[PDB]
């Protein structure tokens, strides 16, 4: 009741003589045997009852210029009463830091010598700090480091303790923690995608993999089924991905770990074989399909520009995707030409039935294809971000409008013309989707979507309240017997007056003509001059901001087209795999006239 | 005028002296009642700390929050409203009772119009 808090206050600040006198006094209080329990009474007088923290963690959490010898005499006292086997490896009891033993706090607080002192004293290294704070839901709620002391020494940039732990006998390197991660997935989750100056994590990954010297750390999957390569492609870290995909290590006994084998080099020309184990579309979930089909990252073009992704997409294009894209565009052009010629020569016999049937067949095909492609619209993050969720909707709406027009035409209903001309107008406005094949037209097909979604929806969501306010404030003072008779004619007159049409004549059948004229002049100064040109200043800002970022958007849209047309193929006709076994080992060759010249010029 | 050095540095709009005063951690004994932020525990990047709210609230009639928000004679008001314990104080003051009052006021004005 009194010695426990006394020794807990004693261990904190570092009064050594008070500490050793209270430990020998605790030994005398232990000497009078109450014959209840040998270890539980010692734990009750040594560990706190609320948190679970022992005197060792309290010594380590509160470092001071006399912090080593208090741990040494405390371990000597633990060594004295035969308690050290269940004392130096004690964990928390609460479910917050549940598992955080003394070795983790020793490693985290940059105390390497105390860490080696505990590991030489018989500390456990396979401990798992599996508390909920250690594996939180997001990145901002807790410290995720893989809950092992080896990964904690690796992520906090202390390579001394990493070398000190890998040379130990018991420290299993491929130990998978609660999420499934080994040390390499934890190193990937800590790393930073932007090229910062001293990035320790690439060096740590390098030396840990070379110190292990086995393929096993590189290919174990976590609970989501992702290797470190697929995980670094998932999270969007371009530097670790660029290191892993092109890893050239030259000496013998570390050569099966390499992934790029340089075959021959001469000046700037170099031919090299890359490895394509998990970077293809052979398997169901790979680096190409991950780095193209993401939405949760921003540097997708920073990842799609490095080999063997760039040459893989170029070979995949010029082998079989260019002809499939131009063939799809030709079929959609003939479908829209046939729909236009049918809907223009409407009967106000035997020349239309051929001409109606191809339209109906291709409409049923397009509707069921988009029905499948929106049935797989499960993640609902593709809807949030601009990447090609819209065109599935518009193609499906045009197909169902065509088939509804045909089924209303074959019956006695004469409202088929509305559905048919909406189908034809939508079908000719959908041809801008096929302007992603060129380079100078992708910047013109993405601008429409960025400007409609960013600016014009905002300006219309403000302009509707001025339109409604002045519409009822003008229509309600017109005497019933000029043009402003109803609400829904005054709203049309104000819309005509906004876009430069319409008559701003004086004489409407009012009883207050000066008030009517003042409201009309105020509306024209608010929306013809102030609101409209402010919208055009905003649209200029959006178009300027997107036309300096057009080529990234075009490359990403082309890559998504490649992988969609590649998934469209059957299992046969995928006889276009890359290269025979060396492993797949795609052979590429490139010239680097900029790096060779600055490498030589020094 | 009835202003402490904290309220004066908030009045004149000096963000650096304000950032020093509001988060002043001095670690040795005999200079610890002078400190205003007490860091409770730290682990890697996560840190939990207790700040002091003597003159930085709206308990009194003239305080650092009411001064640094209701000024017009300065330009770096957002440079002062982004540092703790002003940022988390405005977030807690929003999500406790001000969001419902703002949306309720908007609904009453919409029905009136
Ligand atoms: C954002 C732009 C807002 C502009 C709204 C234009 C409203 C047009 C309108 O009210 O049309 C009146 C009713 O129209 C409607 O209810 C639907 C109009 C569809 C607008 C779709 C905007 C996209 C009737 O026309 P009228 O010939 O003037 O009636 C008198 C008998 N001859
Ligand atoms: C946008 C709201 C549009 C709702 C339609 C509307 O405003 O109805 C008009 C009545 O005006 C209002 O009540 C304005 C109400 C604003 C609603 C804001 C939400 C008259 O309808 P009409 O049949 O076209 O004119 C016949 C004259 N008796």
XYZ file of C-alpha atoms and ligand atoms in Angstrom:
775
model
C 0.000 0.000 0.000
C 2.978 2.268 0.666
C 6.128 0.447 -0.460
C 4.748 -0.151 -3.961
C 4.233 3.514 -4.823
C 7.497 4.285 -3.019
C 9.492 1.956 -5.265
C 7.580 3.166 -8.345
C 8.523 6.750 -7.515
C 12.031 5.584 -6.629
C 12.743 3.909 -9.963
C 11.660 6.957 -11.996
C 14.021 9.850 -11.230
C 17.075 7.702 -10.551
C 18.050 7.966 -6.882
C 20.247 4.863 -6.816
C 20.878 4.526 -3.075
C 17.189 5.061 -2.261
C 16.441 2.429 -4.910
C 18.787 -0.228 -3.532
C 17.656 0.425 0.043
C 13.996 0.076 -0.927
C 14.767 -3.108 -2.874
C 16.505 -4.642 0.130
C 13.574 -3.469 2.298
C 11.238 -5.179 -0.179
C 13.414 -8.270 0.260
C 12.846 -8.108 4.030
C 9.096 -7.661 3.485
C 9.270 -10.693 1.183
C 11.235 -12.604 3.852
C 8.229 -12.867 6.177
C 6.516 -15.656 4.250
C 2.739 -15.242 4.200
C 2.660 -18.759 2.549
C 0.227 -17.681 -0.189
C 2.237 -17.388 -3.429
C 5.897 -16.995 -4.373
C 5.746 -15.232 -7.822
C 2.370 -13.492 -7.589
C 3.262 -11.501 -4.468
C 6.495 -10.358 -6.118
C 4.578 -9.307 -9.234
C 2.000 -7.555 -7.031
C 4.759 -5.564 -5.329
C 6.668 -4.949 -8.568
C 4.041 -4.338 -11.278
C 1.382 -1.644 -11.192
C -2.178 -2.882 -10.826
C -3.834 -0.345 -13.140
C -1.683 -0.332 -16.293
C 0.442 -3.455 -15.852
C 3.752 -1.638 -16.239
C 6.640 -3.070 -14.251
C 9.487 -1.100 -12.702
C 11.614 -1.827 -15.775
C 9.337 0.022 -18.201
C 9.026 2.888 -15.716
C 12.818 2.993 -15.618
C 13.037 3.009 -19.413
C 10.184 5.432 -20.160
C 11.805 8.133 -17.995
C 15.463 8.177 -19.064
C 18.024 10.231 -17.154
C 21.834 10.509 -16.781
C 21.853 7.527 -14.352
C 19.709 5.081 -16.307
C 21.960 2.078 -16.955
C 23.008 0.938 -13.490
C 19.460 1.156 -12.129
C 18.451 -1.384 -14.784
C 21.524 -3.452 -13.883
C 20.786 -3.554 -10.144
C 17.097 -4.103 -10.890
C 17.927 -7.120 -13.051
C 20.286 -8.313 -10.309
C 17.390 -8.087 -7.845
C 15.222 -9.926 -10.380
C 18.025 -12.463 -10.789
C 18.194 -12.882 -7.004
C 14.622 -13.967 -6.207
C 14.164 -16.231 -9.304
C 11.551 -14.057 -10.995
C 13.443 -12.862 -14.081
C 11.932 -15.471 -16.398
C 8.487 -13.916 -15.947
C 9.644 -10.353 -15.244
C 11.817 -9.115 -18.117
C 9.259 -10.444 -20.625
C 6.146 -9.100 -18.908
C 3.589 -7.471 -21.174
C 0.833 -4.998 -20.510
C -2.502 -6.119 -19.115
C -4.647 -3.373 -20.648
C -5.870 -3.711 -24.226
C -4.266 -0.422 -25.309
C -0.543 -1.228 -25.554
C -1.268 -4.934 -25.190
C 2.055 -6.679 -25.595
C 4.531 -3.811 -25.379
C 7.259 -5.372 -23.240
C 10.475 -3.733 -22.028
C 12.544 -4.556 -25.106
C 10.277 -2.462 -27.345
C 10.561 0.604 -25.112
C 14.292 -0.014 -24.853
C 14.663 -0.095 -28.640
C 12.330 2.841 -29.309
C 14.009 5.303 -26.924
C 17.354 5.059 -28.819
C 18.927 3.109 -25.913
C 21.010 0.591 -27.823
C 23.275 -0.451 -24.957
C 20.349 -1.104 -22.599
C 18.764 -3.062 -25.458
C 21.844 -5.273 -25.794
C 21.908 -5.586 -22.002
C 18.340 -6.905 -21.951
C 18.889 -9.254 -24.902
C 21.979 -10.671 -23.196
C 19.851 -11.117 -20.052
C 17.415 -13.474 -21.783
C 14.822 -11.157 -23.292
C 12.316 -12.528 -25.767
C 12.459 -11.369 -29.377
C 9.405 -13.222 -30.749
C 7.147 -10.928 -28.693
C 4.135 -9.486 -30.491
C 2.741 -6.154 -29.298
C -0.667 -7.041 -30.707
C -2.677 -4.315 -28.992
C -5.328 -2.336 -30.828
C -3.316 0.894 -30.700
C -0.416 -0.915 -32.393
C -2.611 -2.038 -35.327
C -5.199 0.748 -35.661
C -7.624 1.268 -38.508
C -5.889 4.261 -40.099
C -2.355 5.666 -40.268
C -3.127 8.652 -38.014
C -4.407 6.734 -34.984
C -1.416 4.627 -33.944
C 2.155 3.583 -34.636
C 2.182 0.623 -36.996
C 5.600 -0.991 -37.237
C 4.854 -4.719 -37.481
C 4.926 -5.372 -33.668
C 8.299 -7.129 -33.582
C 11.508 -5.785 -32.017
C 13.422 -6.473 -35.226
C 10.980 -4.441 -37.308
C 10.890 -1.760 -34.608
C 14.664 -1.490 -34.757
C 14.484 -1.425 -38.548
C 11.769 1.223 -38.998
C 13.156 3.620 -36.370
C 16.550 3.752 -38.178
C 18.819 1.997 -35.697
C 20.891 -0.406 -37.811
C 23.186 -1.213 -34.873
C 20.359 -3.024 -33.097
C 19.270 -4.612 -36.392
C 22.736 -6.118 -36.850
C 22.726 -7.022 -33.151
C 19.391 -8.812 -33.541
C 19.981 -10.651 -36.808
C 23.252 -12.096 -35.507
C 21.374 -13.525 -32.509
C 20.355 -17.159 -32.746
C 16.644 -17.107 -31.897
C 15.445 -14.033 -33.824
C 13.441 -15.562 -36.649
C 13.430 -13.128 -39.555
C 10.358 -14.368 -41.446
C 8.093 -14.102 -38.389
C 4.666 -12.985 -39.562
C 2.781 -10.747 -37.147
C -0.980 -10.220 -36.732
C -1.705 -8.535 -40.069
C 0.421 -11.136 -41.838
C 3.347 -8.796 -42.478
C 6.952 -9.840 -42.105
C 9.731 -7.272 -41.639
C 9.752 -6.291 -45.333
C 6.061 -5.367 -45.490
C 6.551 -3.236 -42.380
C 9.499 -1.488 -44.010
C 7.341 -0.853 -47.074
C 4.467 0.577 -44.996
C 6.835 2.997 -43.241
C 8.597 4.256 -46.423
C 7.895 7.567 -48.127
C 7.025 7.918 -51.802
C 8.527 11.346 -52.528
C 12.270 11.464 -53.134
C 13.371 12.834 -49.772
C 17.067 13.432 -49.178
C 18.208 10.756 -46.707
C 15.745 7.898 -47.135
C 16.970 5.266 -44.696
C 14.292 2.711 -45.554
C 15.820 1.735 -48.909
C 19.186 1.095 -47.243
C 17.499 -0.839 -44.434
C 15.547 -3.001 -46.892
C 18.778 -3.557 -48.828
C 20.925 -4.627 -45.891
C 18.199 -6.751 -44.291
C 17.573 -8.666 -47.513
C 21.294 -9.136 -48.166
C 21.916 -10.198 -44.560
C 19.172 -12.805 -44.834
C 20.182 -13.977 -48.294
C 17.100 -15.997 -49.189
C 14.110 -15.624 -51.492
C 11.623 -16.359 -48.711
C 11.287 -12.829 -47.300
C 10.475 -11.513 -50.772
C 7.519 -13.781 -51.472
C 5.439 -14.379 -48.321
C 1.939 -12.980 -48.520
C 0.113 -11.207 -45.713
C -3.581 -11.611 -44.853
C -4.607 -9.773 -48.026
C -2.393 -11.952 -50.209
C 0.186 -9.331 -51.169
C 3.944 -9.767 -51.479
C 6.204 -6.788 -50.620
C 6.278 -5.946 -54.319
C 2.490 -5.932 -54.637
C 2.209 -4.049 -51.343
C 4.623 -1.341 -52.463
C 2.590 -1.083 -55.653
C -0.673 -0.930 -53.676
C 0.341 1.839 -51.294
C 1.902 3.888 -54.078
C 5.540 4.147 -52.992
C 7.532 4.727 -56.147
C 11.052 4.640 -54.710
C 10.847 1.200 -53.095
C 9.138 -0.048 -56.255
C 11.909 1.354 -58.453
C 14.467 -0.285 -56.192
C 12.785 -3.701 -56.158
C 11.959 -3.988 -59.871
C 15.520 -3.151 -60.979
C 17.859 -4.701 -58.407
C 21.309 -5.498 -59.795
C 23.708 -7.154 -57.349
C 26.955 -8.171 -58.978
C 28.815 -10.585 -56.711
C 28.311 -14.335 -56.588
C 26.168 -15.964 -53.813
C 23.822 -12.943 -54.094
C 22.663 -13.331 -57.678
C 19.432 -15.292 -57.467
C 18.130 -12.347 -55.429
C 18.676 -9.999 -58.361
C 15.799 -9.154 -60.673
C 17.479 -7.375 -63.586
C 20.345 -9.158 -65.334
C 22.291 -6.831 -67.604
C 23.297 -8.820 -70.658
C 25.612 -6.415 -72.451
C 26.524 -2.756 -72.331
C 28.395 -0.505 -74.740
C 28.517 3.226 -74.164
C 24.896 4.258 -73.837
C 23.358 1.123 -75.360
C 22.417 -1.559 -72.853
C 20.461 -4.791 -73.186
C 19.178 -6.331 -69.974
C 16.789 -9.080 -68.931
C 14.159 -8.167 -66.355
C 12.156 -10.597 -64.263
C 8.384 -10.923 -64.623
C 7.317 -13.126 -61.729
C 4.685 -10.881 -60.153
C 4.758 -8.048 -62.721
C 2.422 -9.094 -65.550
C -1.140 -10.155 -65.967
C -0.396 -13.878 -65.755
C -1.593 -14.118 -62.163
C -4.837 -12.644 -60.903
C -3.366 -9.783 -58.851
C -0.036 -8.339 -59.947
C 1.945 -5.112 -60.062
C 0.682 -3.938 -63.448
C -2.979 -4.533 -62.605
C -2.457 -2.913 -59.203
C -0.585 0.185 -60.316
C -2.995 0.876 -63.176
C -6.319 0.162 -61.466
C -5.682 2.243 -58.347
C -7.539 5.362 -57.331
C -6.214 5.931 -53.788
C -2.868 7.350 -54.973
C -1.589 10.302 -56.973
C 1.778 9.187 -58.406
C 0.435 6.471 -60.733
C 2.314 8.020 -63.647
C 5.446 8.086 -61.508
C 5.077 4.297 -61.283
C 3.930 3.594 -64.843
C 7.051 5.145 -66.377
C 9.685 2.696 -65.136
C 10.722 -0.568 -66.669
C 9.433 -3.349 -67.007
C 6.095 -1.573 -66.938
C 6.681 0.939 -69.724
C 7.945 -1.543 -72.295
C 5.345 -4.044 -71.137
C 2.529 -1.650 -71.909
C 4.126 -0.692 -75.232
C 4.471 -4.321 -76.306
C 0.957 -5.063 -75.058
C -0.330 -2.128 -77.105
C 1.388 -2.704 -80.436
C 0.871 -6.465 -80.350
C -2.891 -6.725 -79.964
C -4.567 -3.688 -78.396
C -4.283 -1.064 -81.133
C -6.226 -3.183 -83.611
C -8.847 -4.002 -80.988
C -9.279 -0.323 -80.108
C -9.583 0.853 -83.713
C -11.935 -2.046 -84.458
C -14.146 -1.085 -81.508
C -14.197 2.513 -82.724
C -15.180 1.427 -86.245
C -18.007 -0.756 -84.935
C -19.342 2.058 -82.775
C -19.105 4.498 -85.683
C -21.143 2.195 -87.918
C -23.676 1.616 -85.138
C -24.155 5.351 -84.707
C -24.346 5.977 -88.467
C -27.054 3.314 -88.779
C -28.915 4.761 -85.788
C -28.722 8.265 -87.280
C -29.969 7.170 -90.707
C -32.824 5.216 -89.126
C -33.895 8.018 -86.797
C -33.731 10.657 -89.521
C -35.751 8.731 -92.121
C -38.554 7.932 -89.710
C -41.865 6.980 -91.387
C -43.602 10.264 -90.285
C -40.845 -1.058 -95.096
C -38.204 -3.684 -96.028
C -35.432 -1.052 -96.096
C -35.638 -0.306 -92.362
C -35.911 -3.815 -90.861
C -32.403 -4.401 -92.039
C -31.140 -1.280 -90.321
C -33.327 -1.725 -87.256
C -32.039 -5.219 -86.487
C -28.298 -4.487 -86.481
C -29.039 -1.572 -84.150
C -31.027 -3.843 -81.826
C -28.380 -6.596 -81.836
C -25.499 -4.232 -81.094
C -27.621 -2.464 -78.483
C -28.340 -5.728 -76.662
C -24.622 -6.586 -76.792
C -23.576 -3.164 -75.468
C -26.232 -3.190 -72.739
C -25.222 -6.603 -71.425
C -21.509 -5.693 -71.596
C -22.050 -2.556 -69.552
C -24.339 -4.505 -67.224
C -21.459 -6.847 -66.464
C -19.023 -3.932 -66.192
C -21.216 -2.107 -63.652
C -21.998 -5.361 -61.831
C -18.256 -5.392 -61.040
C -18.437 -1.769 -59.851
C -18.036 -2.890 -56.239
C -15.279 -0.648 -54.716
C -17.218 2.676 -54.986
C -13.953 4.613 -54.946
C -13.880 4.495 -58.743
C -17.032 6.602 -58.618
C -15.334 9.227 -56.442
C -12.417 9.796 -58.821
C -12.749 10.781 -62.512
C -11.337 7.558 -64.005
C -13.909 6.199 -66.438
C -16.885 5.386 -64.255
C -18.985 7.879 -66.213
C -18.710 6.301 -69.648
C -20.061 2.948 -68.457
C -23.183 4.805 -67.297
C -23.592 6.749 -70.527
C -23.079 3.726 -72.797
C -25.572 1.715 -70.752
C -28.149 4.526 -70.829
C -27.837 4.886 -74.603
C -28.195 1.132 -75.118
C -31.286 0.835 -72.926
C -32.780 3.904 -74.640
C -32.350 2.254 -78.046
C -33.950 -1.034 -76.971
C -36.784 0.815 -75.215
C -37.408 2.792 -78.399
C -37.541 -0.404 -80.457
C -39.940 -2.123 -78.046
C -42.148 0.971 -77.977
C -42.047 1.195 -81.770
C -43.143 -2.400 -82.336
C -46.202 -1.756 -80.161
C -48.847 0.924 -80.749
C -47.087 3.535 -78.598
C -45.988 6.715 -80.358
C -43.639 7.973 -77.646
C -40.822 6.082 -79.358
C -39.493 9.241 -80.982
C -38.460 10.805 -77.672
C -36.399 7.788 -76.622
C -34.987 7.425 -80.129
C -33.735 10.985 -80.508
C -32.342 11.018 -76.971
C -30.552 7.814 -77.945
C -29.171 9.366 -81.128
C -28.012 12.587 -79.447
C -26.331 10.614 -76.671
C -24.788 8.249 -79.197
C -23.152 11.042 -81.114
C -21.966 12.787 -77.977
C -20.399 9.513 -76.813
C -17.870 9.471 -79.637
C -15.578 11.701 -77.585
C -14.635 8.645 -75.534
C -12.704 7.397 -78.560
C -10.581 10.555 -78.611
C -8.211 8.985 -76.110
C -6.297 7.232 -78.872
C -4.589 10.435 -79.943
C -2.403 12.562 -77.710
C -3.735 16.030 -78.503
C -7.354 14.926 -77.997
C -7.107 13.292 -74.580
C -6.472 16.771 -73.201
C -9.736 17.808 -74.847
C -11.801 14.867 -73.647
C -10.765 15.150 -69.999
C -11.314 18.933 -69.890
C -15.060 18.560 -70.436
C -15.393 16.252 -67.448
C -13.157 18.339 -65.175
C -14.985 21.563 -66.045
C -18.508 20.090 -65.762
C -17.712 18.440 -62.431
C -15.628 21.196 -60.821
C -16.879 24.579 -62.004
C -20.142 24.474 -63.964
C -21.951 22.455 -61.294
C -20.797 24.991 -58.693
C -21.808 28.018 -60.762
C -25.163 26.488 -61.603
C -25.735 25.606 -57.938
C -25.268 29.299 -57.143
C -27.009 30.727 -60.250
C -30.222 28.756 -59.627
C -30.907 30.741 -56.468
C -30.635 34.063 -58.345
C -32.784 32.654 -61.149
C -35.505 31.517 -58.726
C -35.385 34.695 -56.634
C -35.714 37.095 -59.523
C -38.174 34.794 -61.294
C -40.707 34.936 -58.496
C -39.856 38.595 -57.795
C -40.675 39.439 -61.413
C -43.592 37.119 -62.137
C -45.573 38.098 -59.054
C -45.980 41.767 -59.977
C -47.246 41.184 -63.521
C -50.970 41.847 -63.785
C -52.936 38.954 -65.255
C -54.607 39.812 -68.562
C -46.834 40.757 -70.751
C -44.307 38.029 -71.497
C -43.689 37.416 -67.777
C -47.080 35.816 -67.228
C -46.265 32.712 -65.229
C -43.302 31.585 -63.199
C -42.113 29.174 -65.886
C -42.138 31.833 -68.577
C -40.337 34.411 -66.455
C -37.664 31.845 -65.639
C -37.193 31.218 -69.370
C -37.035 34.946 -70.064
C -34.380 35.400 -67.399
C -32.400 32.487 -68.828
C -32.579 34.096 -72.264
C -31.461 37.393 -70.756
C -28.458 35.742 -69.103
C -27.023 34.342 -72.353
C -27.423 37.542 -74.355
C -30.738 36.742 -75.995
C -34.121 38.092 -74.996
C -35.614 41.551 -74.972
C -35.059 44.016 -72.151
C -38.015 46.117 -73.276
C -39.718 48.489 -70.849
C -43.456 47.904 -71.331
C -44.609 44.769 -69.617
C -48.131 44.828 -68.184
C -47.058 45.945 -64.723
C -48.360 48.385 -62.163
C -44.825 49.341 -61.035
C -42.669 49.753 -64.146
C -39.735 51.471 -62.445
C -39.477 48.668 -59.880
C -39.703 46.061 -62.633
C -36.977 47.816 -64.598
C -34.761 48.144 -61.519
C -35.088 44.423 -60.824
C -34.274 43.597 -64.448
C -31.195 45.850 -64.507
C -30.052 44.343 -61.197
C -30.420 40.841 -62.609
C -28.416 41.710 -65.724
C -25.613 43.306 -63.698
C -25.542 40.297 -61.364
C -25.509 37.490 -63.908
C -24.607 38.815 -67.366
C -21.612 40.766 -66.053
C -20.676 39.587 -62.581
C -21.514 35.893 -62.338
C -20.894 34.690 -65.880
C -17.464 36.261 -66.322
C -16.436 35.101 -62.853
C -17.335 31.584 -63.993
C -15.191 32.076 -67.106
C -12.274 33.196 -64.916
C -12.724 29.988 -62.912
C -12.952 27.828 -66.054
C -9.774 29.470 -67.287
C -8.074 28.515 -64.028
C -9.250 24.887 -64.324
C -8.248 24.555 -68.003
C -4.824 26.061 -67.268
C -4.341 23.677 -64.338
C -5.321 20.604 -66.380
C -3.487 21.420 -69.618
C -0.135 21.374 -67.825
C -1.093 17.924 -66.506
C -2.580 16.341 -69.633
C 0.013 13.774 -70.657
C -0.177 11.931 -67.326
C -3.947 11.619 -67.686
C -3.612 10.411 -71.263
C -0.986 7.792 -70.358
C -3.124 6.503 -67.503
C -6.251 6.322 -69.672
C -4.318 4.461 -72.366
C -3.009 1.980 -69.783
C -6.505 1.313 -68.465
C -7.654 0.697 -72.052
C -4.777 -1.794 -72.521
C -5.624 -3.835 -69.452
C -9.365 -3.809 -70.162
C -8.836 -5.099 -73.703
C -6.435 -7.684 -72.321
C -9.022 -8.935 -69.840
C -11.545 -9.093 -72.691
C -9.611 -11.918 -74.369
C -10.331 -15.608 -73.627
C -7.837 -18.032 -72.073
C -6.821 -19.112 -75.531
C -5.289 -16.211 -77.602
C -3.161 -15.336 -74.572
C -0.339 -17.006 -76.461
C 1.218 -13.509 -76.405
C 3.131 -13.955 -73.166
C 6.479 -12.271 -72.998
C 9.564 -14.501 -73.038
C 10.542 -18.090 -72.315
C 12.198 -19.169 -69.116
C 15.704 -18.247 -68.037
C 11.005 -16.960 -64.332
C 9.903 -15.156 -67.469
C 12.717 -12.613 -67.994
C 11.550 -10.036 -70.516
C 14.505 -8.868 -72.608
C 14.602 -5.129 -73.168
C 17.286 -2.798 -74.471
C 17.570 0.943 -74.128
C 19.871 3.889 -74.705
C 20.487 6.444 -71.966
C 22.237 9.328 -73.699
C 21.822 11.651 -70.709
C 23.110 9.352 -67.964
C 25.996 7.992 -70.044
C 27.277 11.448 -70.952
C 27.206 12.814 -67.407
C 28.675 9.546 -66.134
C 31.533 9.827 -68.628
C 32.089 13.594 -68.392
C 33.282 13.415 -64.773
C -5.919 47.942 -21.145
C -6.156 44.778 -19.061
C -4.012 42.519 -21.241
C -1.479 39.924 -20.120
C 1.593 39.301 -22.331
C -0.279 36.391 -23.888
C -3.327 38.497 -24.742
C -1.060 41.319 -25.918
C 0.889 39.041 -28.247
C -2.447 37.820 -29.571
C -3.710 41.399 -29.975
C -0.744 42.734 -31.922
C -0.607 39.661 -34.139
C 2.857 38.259 -33.419
C 2.677 34.573 -34.222
C 6.157 33.506 -33.121
C 5.959 34.770 -29.537
C 2.448 33.315 -29.347
C 3.658 29.924 -30.578
C 6.447 30.042 -28.019
C 4.209 30.989 -25.087
C 1.321 28.587 -25.751
C 3.605 25.538 -26.054
C 6.436 26.038 -23.560
C 8.000 22.778 -22.381
C 10.772 23.140 -19.799
C 11.977 19.809 -18.500
C 14.017 20.338 -15.341
C 12.626 20.610 -11.831
C 12.166 24.054 -10.135
C 11.099 25.404 -13.563
C 8.005 23.306 -14.172
C 5.120 25.407 -12.912
C 6.183 27.920 -15.573
C 5.551 25.372 -18.315
C 2.262 25.383 -20.190
C 2.335 22.125 -22.153
C 2.961 18.910 -20.223
C 3.771 16.009 -22.523
C 2.164 12.920 -21.048
C 3.556 10.168 -23.247
C 5.372 9.829 -26.536
C 6.022 6.863 -28.806
C 7.530 7.375 -32.232
C 5.282 9.920 -33.892
C 2.319 9.568 -31.522
C 2.305 12.017 -28.628
C -0.303 12.854 -26.005
C 0.170 16.108 -24.128
C -1.816 18.309 -21.771
C -2.030 21.994 -22.648
C -3.017 24.787 -20.298
C -6.176 26.838 -20.832
C -5.918 29.684 -18.342
C -6.335 32.636 -20.702
C -6.969 30.685 -23.929
C -10.699 29.886 -23.992
C -13.944 31.736 -23.791
C -14.331 31.302 -20.033
C -13.197 34.848 -19.303
C -14.484 37.904 -21.115
C -11.341 38.701 -23.127
C -9.049 35.825 -24.055
C -6.687 34.623 -26.761
C -9.292 32.801 -28.844
C -11.737 35.716 -28.849
C -8.876 38.112 -29.587
C -7.220 36.191 -32.399
C -10.523 35.477 -34.145
C -12.238 38.856 -33.787
C -9.324 40.976 -35.001
C -9.230 43.039 -38.154
C -5.983 45.008 -37.693
C -3.739 42.054 -38.614
C -3.095 39.802 -41.591
C -1.713 36.547 -40.132
C -4.879 35.461 -38.291
C -4.722 32.071 -39.992
C -1.079 31.798 -38.972
C -2.320 32.066 -35.377
C -5.481 29.968 -35.676
C -3.573 26.884 -36.841
C -1.560 26.128 -33.702
C -2.620 24.163 -30.685
C -4.596 24.598 -28.357
C -6.566 26.792 -30.724
C -7.033 24.341 -33.586
C -8.304 21.452 -31.485
C -10.312 23.882 -29.385
C -12.203 25.117 -32.410
C -12.671 21.559 -33.689
C -14.089 20.372 -30.369
C -16.228 23.506 -30.118
C -17.555 22.811 -33.613
C -18.379 19.116 -33.402
C -19.804 19.367 -29.891
C -22.497 21.999 -30.331
C -21.967 24.379 -33.254
C -22.602 22.157 -36.273
C -26.139 21.348 -35.157
C -26.817 25.000 -34.364
C -25.565 26.092 -37.791
C -27.572 23.504 -39.725
C -30.624 24.277 -37.586
C -30.287 27.996 -38.347
C -30.001 27.208 -42.051
C -33.125 25.024 -41.942
C -35.123 27.726 -40.160
C -34.052 30.348 -42.678
C -34.877 28.016 -45.566
C -38.396 27.451 -44.242
C -38.846 31.178 -43.630
C -37.877 31.951 -47.212
C -29.759 25.939 -65.691
C -30.613 26.642 -66.850
C -32.078 26.984 -66.305
C -33.018 27.427 -67.522
C -34.479 26.818 -67.292
C -35.355 27.008 -68.618
C -36.901 26.809 -68.250
C -37.764 26.659 -69.590
C -39.310 26.492 -69.206
O -39.701 26.879 -68.094
O -40.262 25.892 -70.151
C -41.599 25.634 -69.596
C -41.586 24.264 -68.767
O -40.344 23.547 -69.064
C -40.063 22.457 -68.128
O -40.837 22.242 -67.180
C -38.755 21.554 -68.336
C -37.585 22.425 -69.003
C -36.261 21.533 -69.089
C -34.991 22.413 -68.675
C -33.715 21.457 -68.530
C -32.419 22.319 -68.158
C -31.119 21.385 -68.214
C -42.677 25.499 -70.773
O -42.214 26.219 -71.962
P -43.200 27.505 -72.567
O -43.416 27.316 -74.122
O -42.477 28.887 -72.293
O -44.754 27.479 -71.808
C -45.772 28.430 -72.279
C -46.698 27.715 -73.376
N -46.126 27.968 -74.766
C -36.550 24.626 -58.582
C -38.045 24.553 -58.011
C -39.076 24.471 -59.233
C -40.485 23.949 -58.677
C -41.664 24.306 -59.700
C -42.294 25.711 -59.261
O -41.537 26.608 -58.855
O -43.741 25.951 -59.328
C -44.100 27.373 -59.392
C -44.360 27.956 -57.921
O -43.183 28.739 -57.518
C -42.629 28.379 -56.210
O -43.369 27.892 -55.345
C -41.080 28.589 -55.873
C -40.681 27.529 -54.746
C -39.089 27.412 -54.634
C -38.714 25.928 -54.163
C -37.190 25.878 -53.678
C -36.795 24.367 -53.327
C -45.406 27.519 -60.304
O -45.497 26.309 -61.127
P -46.112 26.412 -62.739
O -47.270 25.346 -62.919
O -44.957 26.103 -63.777
O -46.764 27.985 -63.023
C -48.225 28.095 -63.076
C -48.700 29.456 -62.378
N -49.830 29.151 -61.404
